[PDB]
C-alpha cells in the first residue's frame, strides 16, 4: 500500500458496472490502483522486465597492448623486407619505403623496403548482444489495497506467505496468468507490450560491468577492433589499426605505439543511451510499457456482512494529502468485537451523512480481535471543504478537510 501511495506515477482506474474487464497500463516505477463496485481495491505494479539468452553479436576492444615488436629493412635494389610474423593473423604490420644511403648502411641512395610488425593483444573489451522477442519476461505484482496490514508494507519482503498478494509472470508465448488472492478470489491477466519501444531492435551492450541498450547501426559503426560472434578461444581481431599506429619511419626501424583506453570516448558517446543492469545470466531493463486486461469476475470482497465497529476510533496520525489529492488517515480502535467493519466516508452534510467523494480502500475492516489495533485508509475527497468521518454514533470522529 505505502509503496503505491508514495509514487508520483500512480494511475487510478475505475471498473465498469459489468465488473468483468478492466484495462490498465503498467510501467516501471509506477502503480495502478484498480477500484471496482463491490470488489476489493487492487494495486498492480510492474516490478521487473527480463531478457534471457542474449546471444553475442560482436565484441569491441577499447584497450589493447602490443608485444614482440620487430623490424626488417632492405637496401635499395635488395628486394622486399620480410618478417616471420608478417603473415601471422595476430600481428599488425606496416610496409613502407624509407630513404637509405651511406649513413644508413647502404652503398646506394634510394628508397629501401621497411616492414614492422607487432603482436596484438586485447586487455579490456566490450560486447554487444542480441535480444530475441520470445525471450522477454515480465513479472507483475498484485496487492490487495487496504488489508489492514498493507499500510506498513513498503517493499517486496512480505509476499510469499501473504495470501492477499501474488506474483505472476508474463511472456509473449504465455501472455495469460492467474493471480490467486486467497479469500478474495482470483484475478486474470492478459498482458501484451505497448508499441513504441521494441527491445528486439536494440543490442545489449556490456562494458566493464556497466550496461546499456544501444541502436544496431551505431554499434556496427564503432571504429574499434572487433571479432564476430563469440567463437571463444583464439579470436581474430579485425581493424587492429584503430588502436595501433605507426610513427615516422626510420632507416632500419619503425616505432609502434598503442592508443590509450577508449573507455572515456565510448562513455561520452553513450550519453543518451538507456541504462540497463545484469542480474545473473539475465538482463534487467527498466524502461517500457505493458498493456494488461484484467478479468475480475472471480474477485470478491471479504467481510461484506461484518458487523460495524461499535467502539471509539482515534487519529494517531494527522491526515496527509498525497500527490494525487487523496487523504491518508491512521486510526486506532479500542474495541475487541472481533472482525468488524470500519465506518469511513467523506461528508458535507453532517446531519444526514450523505457520502461524497470515493473510498479507495474498499470495505475497511479490523481483523485483530485485540484492542488498540491500528489501520490505515485512503479517501478521494470532493473538491472544496468536506469532513473525514470515522465511526458511527456519538463516538464518531470528524476532521475538517479541503481539496484544491
Amino acid at each position: 500500500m505505502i509503496r503505491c501511495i508514495g509514487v508520483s506515477n500512480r494511475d487510478f482506474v475505475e471498473g465498469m458496472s459489468g465488473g468483468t474487464w478492466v484495462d490498465v497500463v503498467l510501467e516501471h516505477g509506477g502503480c495502478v490502483t484498480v477500484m471496482a463496485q463491490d470488489k476489493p481495491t487492487v494495486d498492480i505494479e510492474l516490478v521487473t522486465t527480463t531478457v534471457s539468452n542474449m546471444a553475442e553479436v560482436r565484441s569491441y576492444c577499447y584497450e589493447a597492448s602490443i608485444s614482440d615488436m620487430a623490424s626488417d629493412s632492405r637496401c635499395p635494389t635488395q628486394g622486399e623486407a620480410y618478417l616471420d610474423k608478417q603473415s601471422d593473423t595476430q600481428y599488425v604490420c606496416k610496409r613502407t619505403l624509407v630513404d637509405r644511403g651511406w649513413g644508413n648502411g647502404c652503398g646506394l641512395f634510394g628508397k629501401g623496403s621497411l616492414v614492422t610488425c607487432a603482436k596484438f593483444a586485447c586487455s579490456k573489451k566490450m560486447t554487444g548482444k542480441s535480444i530475441q522477442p520470445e525471450n522477454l519476461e515480465y513479472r507483475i505484482m498484485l496487492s490487495v489495497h487496504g488489508s489492514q496490514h498493507s499500510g506498513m508494507i513498503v517493499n517486496d519482503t512480505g509476499h510469499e506467505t501473504d495470501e492477499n498478494r501474488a506474483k505472476v509472470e508474463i511472456t509473449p508465448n504465455s501472455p495469460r496468468a492467474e493471480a490467486t488472492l486467497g479469500g478474495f478470489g482470483s484475478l486474470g491477466l492478459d498482458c501484451e507490450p505497448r508499441t513504441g519501444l521494441d527491445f528486439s531492435d536494440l543490442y545489449y551492450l556490456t562494458m566493464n560491468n556497466k550496461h546499456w541498450l544501444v541502436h544496431k547501426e551505431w554499434f556496427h559503426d564503432i571504429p574499434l577492433p572487433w571479432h564476430a560472434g563469440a567463437d571463444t578461444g583464439t579470436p581474430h581481431w579485425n581493424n587492429k589499426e584503430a588502436l595501433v599506429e605507426f610513427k615516422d619511419a626510420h632507416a632500419k626501424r619503425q616505432t609502434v605505439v598503442v592508443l590509450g583506453s577508449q573507455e572515456g570516448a565510448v562513455h561520452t558517446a553513450l550519453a543518451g543511451a538507456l541504462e540497463a543492469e545484469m542480474d545473473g545470466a539475465k538482463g534487467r531493463l527498466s524502461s517500457g510499457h505493458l498493456k494488461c486486461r484484467l478479468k475480475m469476475d472471480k474477485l470478491r470482497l471479504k467481510g461484506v456482512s461484518y458487523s460495524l465497529c461499535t467502539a471509539a476510533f482515534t487519529f494517531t496520525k494527522i491526515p496527509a494529502e498525497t500527490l494525487h489529492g487523496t487523504v491518508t488517515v491512521e486510526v486506532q480502535y479500542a474495541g475487541t468485537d472481533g472482525p468488524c467493519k470500519v465506518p469511513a466516508q467523506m461528508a458535507v452534510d453532517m446531519q444526514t451523512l450523505t457520502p461524497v467523494g470515493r473510498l479507495i480502500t474498499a470495505n475497511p475492516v479490523i481483523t485483530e480481535s485485540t484492542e488498540n489495533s491500528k489501520m490505515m485508509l485512503e479517501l478521494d475527497p470532493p473538491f472544496g471543504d468536506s469532513y473525514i468521518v470515522i465511526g458511527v454514533g456519538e463516538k464518531k470522529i470528524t476532521h475538517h478537510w479541503h481539496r484544491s
Side-chain angles (χ1 to χ4, degrees), residues 1-44 46-348 350-367 369-404:
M1 183 177 176
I2 297 288
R3 183 179 60 79
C4 197
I5 301 299
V7 297
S8 53
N9 189 187
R10 175 183 195 188
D11 288 279
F12 294 86
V13 297
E14 175 149 307
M16 301 294 286
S17 280
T20 309
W21 310 99
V22 173
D23 285 315
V24 298
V25 162
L26 298 183
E27 70 179 301
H28 281 285
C31 182
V32 190
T33 302
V34 182
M35 299 162 282
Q37 188 274 331
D38 298 305
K39 291 188 188 298
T41 310
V42 169
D43 287 332
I44 312 170
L46 179 63
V47 298
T48 184
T49 295
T50 296
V51 288
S52 65
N53 308 333
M54 294 182 286
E56 299 199 17
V57 176
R58 193 182 282 195
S59 301
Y60 283 105
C61 193
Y62 53 97
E63 194 167 6
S65 65
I66 62 170
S67 173
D68 195 16
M69 293 182 286
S71 289
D72 184 67
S73 51
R74 298 284 189 93
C75 285
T77 71
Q78 293 300 303
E80 292 308 281
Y82 171 80
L83 278 176
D84 188 13
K85 289 321 167 180
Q86 160 200 323
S87 310
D88 195 4
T89 65
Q90 306 190 270
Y91 280 71
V92 59
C93 308
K94 179 161 172 202
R95 191 170 286 280
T96 195
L97 298 163
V98 68
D99 289 345
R100 304 296 301 277
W102 284 14
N104 289 337
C106 303
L108 294 174
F109 295 97
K111 301 281 189 187
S113 196
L114 167 68
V115 59
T116 298
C117 297
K119 184 183 285 185
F120 181 90
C122 181
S123 315
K124 300 289 94 176
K125 67 180 182 180
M126 74 180 161
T127 310
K129 296 183 290 294
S130 191
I131 301 171
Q132 278 68 241
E134 65 263 28
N135 299 336
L136 277 296
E137 190 191 16
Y138 307 96
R139 294 179 66 188
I140 292 193
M141 183 177 177
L142 305 96
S143 295
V144 168
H145 183 97
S147 72
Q148 191 183 2
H149 291 292
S150 63
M152 65 179 288
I153 301 299
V154 76
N155 51 349
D156 301 354
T157 58
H159 44 104
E160 173 62 32
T161 61
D162 196 340
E163 88 187 13
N164 299 336
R165 183 176 292 171
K167 298 291 180 68
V168 306
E169 65 183 1
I170 303 297
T171 59
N173 189 359
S174 68
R176 291 178 308 141
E178 297 287 317
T180 57
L181 292 185
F184 290 99
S186 72
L187 287 180
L189 280 82
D190 184 25
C191 299
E192 60 195 40
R194 189 204 91 180
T195 61
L197 195 45
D198 190 4
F199 300 115
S200 67
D201 306 329
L202 294 174
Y203 286 147
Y204 191 100
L205 181 57
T206 304
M207 179 192 194
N208 190 32
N209 301 126
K210 277 74 69 177
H211 303 273
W212 296 269
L213 300 184
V214 305
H215 300 101
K216 290 187 175 177
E217 294 188 359
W218 172 91
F219 185 72
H220 293 313
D221 285 349
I222 297 177
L224 285 176
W226 62 278
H227 76 76
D231 307 323
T232 312
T234 46
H236 176 69
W237 296 95
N238 312 274
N239 199 6
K240 312 181 220 282
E241 294 92 347
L243 284 183
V244 173
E245 263 170 345
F246 300 83
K247 297 296 289 183
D248 299 333
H250 284 344
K252 310 175 71 70
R253 65 181 294 276
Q254 204 163 12
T255 61
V256 186
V257 302
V258 292
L259 282 72
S261 183
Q262 303 298 310
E263 198 185 18
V266 178
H267 205 127
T268 311
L270 287 175
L274 294 174
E275 293 181 359
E277 268 297 332
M278 194 94 190
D279 291 331
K282 283 153 144 179
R284 204 159 291 233
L285 318 180
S286 55
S287 181
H289 288 94
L290 194 72
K291 301 180 292 183
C292 291
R293 176 160 280 170
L294 282 71
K295 202 202 183 63
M296 305 157 83
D297 61 308
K298 277 74 69 177
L299 192 74
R300 60 185 180 271
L301 271 165
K302 294 174 51 184
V304 178
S305 293
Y306 279 174
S307 63
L308 273 191
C309 310
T310 198
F313 287 89
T314 51
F315 282 125
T316 61
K317 184 177 179 180
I318 190 167
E321 188 184 29
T322 63
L323 300 167
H324 316 103
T326 64
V327 189
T328 50
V329 298
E330 202 191 48
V331 291
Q332 189 192 231
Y333 189 58
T336 49
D337 45 350
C340 66
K341 201 180 304 177
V342 164
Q345 65 164 286
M346 305 285 321
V348 186
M350 314 318 302
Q351 293 179 356
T352 186
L353 276 297
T354 303
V356 295
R358 297 187 306 191
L359 181 88
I360 299 167
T361 60
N363 202 249
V365 297
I366 297 169
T367 61
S369 55
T370 61
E371 69 174 19
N372 304 336
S373 179
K374 292 181 181 180
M375 183 278 288
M376 293 177 70
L377 308 157
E378 194 180 355
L379 289 92
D380 190 67
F383 286 91
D385 291 325
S386 53
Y387 282 85
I388 298 175
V389 183
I390 305 298
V392 293
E394 310 172 290
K395 299 289 94 176
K396 68 181 178 67
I397 62 170
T398 61
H399 203 287
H400 172 274
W401 190 265
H402 175 80
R403 187 176 183 176
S404 299

